[model samples]
Target: PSPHVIMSLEELREATASNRISVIVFTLPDSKRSNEIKEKLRKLAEVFPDVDTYSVDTSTNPEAREWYNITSVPTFVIEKGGEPLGEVKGPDIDKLRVTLDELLA
Candidate 1:
């Protein structure tokens, strides 16, 4: 029930392209933190209207795995202008919030 659940590889392109700042969460099956973190990401993203948030399964998406260099489950990456700025390896929404604002500020 996140704000955006990217179902196809092509959707990722447009979802990110629509906004200047975008956050993509690479989810993994059976990860304890995946569910909770995903829901939280939805609420957290609401405060930042400029940033687009998306959730996708890494296990099913190999292109994402290689593109983002997903080293951990539920990893979220911050991107700007179609380029990756950085990533947090866990449920670090607080860090993400700060980072999101810093870039937009």
Candidate 2:
């Protein structure tokens, strides 16, 4: 397991400094798609070690709604240099992976 859970933004920031794309996945705990995308995200993390994959447990951290400007559950946002590049709601693993490759390439 990672040294920290996705409980704090500073941990995200720490990972980003190493050219890692910090991912915030806003998901409900009981959602089926959340589990599905998490599997895909795991693969992506393995393929791209420099990227730190994380899921924000919005179920517990309601503050994430405001901190991440999150209006939708099941949203993916990419951050680097302590700034959000872009965000999209729902799981589009292919689109997200391709975009990340393009950005990080």
Candidate 3:
């Protein structure tokens, strides 16, 4: 569906607390791969207003690294109803779309 972007752990909690669908992207602010993932999400953001994207900068928020278990940059994670639906790592464009459908489905 769609997304509202936020980077703080507090805000992250609020999004999940609202029982809304969340697509959180764990990224390194300076990575090319991360930038691509963000661009892709930004594109989808316009298309899927019901699905919102949150990019957690693991660079500063080391807390997000351990919390979301962000093993690498540009990791895409999805959460809903206090449970994780699934995740796609490494910017696989098609899989993210298909998985997004699964989340909504």
Candidate 4:
């Protein structure tokens, strides 16, 4: 499955309420690195069934961006049970995988 696009705080809240881990992606429009991270997360979604991936375009959703403290274009915040586990602030695919692997394990 692909990452779902989340446009509101209510949607984000609903997504993270589940037992599964939530990968919240904060991205900017037309950012190359942001696009790369989204692609990687989409691929991971196929393999990791226990996790849900979501993306918010930070350019338009200032609330989501500010709530997550997204200082960069392609930041990923990992959450479970409404609490944050960790976050990756760039297109570091290996780090992202490692973080998710540790959580899932």
The lDDT values for all models are: 0.79, 0.72, 0.75, 0.84
Q: What tens-digit string does per-residue lDDT give for candidate 2 at 1-105?
A: 321247665555565555556766777879977777877776777777667777876777776667787887788888886778768688888888877888776
lDDT per residue (tens digit) for residues 1-105 in model 4 = 458989797889888888788998888889876767787888987778888899899888888777878898788899988899999878777898898898777
Q: Order of all candidates by TM-score, from best down to worst?
A: 4, 1, 3, 2
Query: In terms of TM-score, which candidate is strongest?
Result: 4
- Segments of candidate 2 deviating more than 4 angstroms: 1-4, 9-19
Candidate 1, residues 1-105, lDDT tens digits: the string is 575777777778766665478898888868887878888888887788777788888888878677667887778888877777778877788887787777776
Cα-based lDDT at residue 3, candidate 3: 32
Between prediction 2 and prediction 3, the one with superior TM-score is 3
C-alpha RMSD values across all candidates: 1.6, 2.7, 2.6, 1.4
* Candidate 4 TM-score, C-alpha based: 0.90
Over 4 Å off, model 1: none
- lDDT tens per residue, model 3, 1-105: 223556677778778654667788887878866667777787776666566677888888887678878897778888876577889898786888888887676
lDDT, candidate 4, at 5: 89
Better of 2 and 3 by lDDT: 3
* Per-prediction backbone clash count: 0, 0, 9, 0
